[PDB]
């Protein structure tokens, strides 16, 4: 499944992620800039924050309270598109998924 990461300045990164991996790993394991992933996907740092593209938001599973609670600690979260990538699992049907990276991670 191809995952597309777009930095805030508009630089496009494309990665081929195997189903089962998380979006966070897809970016981390492939050297995509903008994702810190400090807690390693334990949904405790929120430094894997990103804005899912409006066109795909409805195709992802909805966020659980544990995740939503942690997004409020991310850098400039968006109630509509913000998500923690470590909480989104790649699946073949998400081939072509587009994610926009914030300017900073906290």
CA–CA dist 28, 39 (Å, integer): 12
> Is there a contact between 1 and 17 (Cβ–Cβ < 8 Å)?
yes
Kindly indicate which of the ranges 10-18, 33-41, 75-83, 95-103 contains the residues binding ligand FES, using the contact rule CB under 6 A.
Answer: 33-41
Question: Could you tell me which stretch among 6-14, 45-53, 56-64, 96-104 binds ligand FES (CB under 6 A)?
Answer: 45-53
Q: Does 48 bind ligand FES (CB under 6 A)?
A: yes
> Is 72 among the residues that bind ligand FES (CB under 6 A)?
no
- Distances, alpha carbon 74 to alpha carbons 12, 24, 46, 106, in Å: 22, 15, 6, 6
- Establish whether 43 is an annotated binding residue: no
Least gap, CB of 36 to ligand FES (angstroms) = 7
- Joined together, the tokens standing for residue 57 give 């938001």
- Report DSSP state, residue 49: E
| 56 secondary structure, DSSP code | H
- Nearer Cβ to ligand FES, position 24 or 98? 24
Give contact residues for ligand FES (rule: CB under 6 A).
24, 37-39, 41-48, 70, 84, 86
């Amino acid at each position: 499944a191809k995952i597309i990461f777009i930095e805030h300045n508009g630089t496009r990164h494309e990665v081929e992620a195997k189903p089962g991996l998380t979006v966070m790993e897809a970016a981390r394991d492939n050297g995509v800039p903008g994702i810190d992933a400090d807690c390693g996907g334990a949904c405790a740092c929120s430094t894997c924050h990103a804005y899912v593209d409006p066109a795909w938001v409805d195709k992802l599973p909805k966020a659980l309270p544990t995740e939503t609670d942690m997004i409020d600690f991310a850098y400039e979260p968006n109630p509509a598109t913000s998500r923690l990538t470590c909480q989104i699992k790649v699946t073949s049907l998400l081939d072509g998924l587009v994610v926009h990276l914030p300017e900073k991670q906290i």
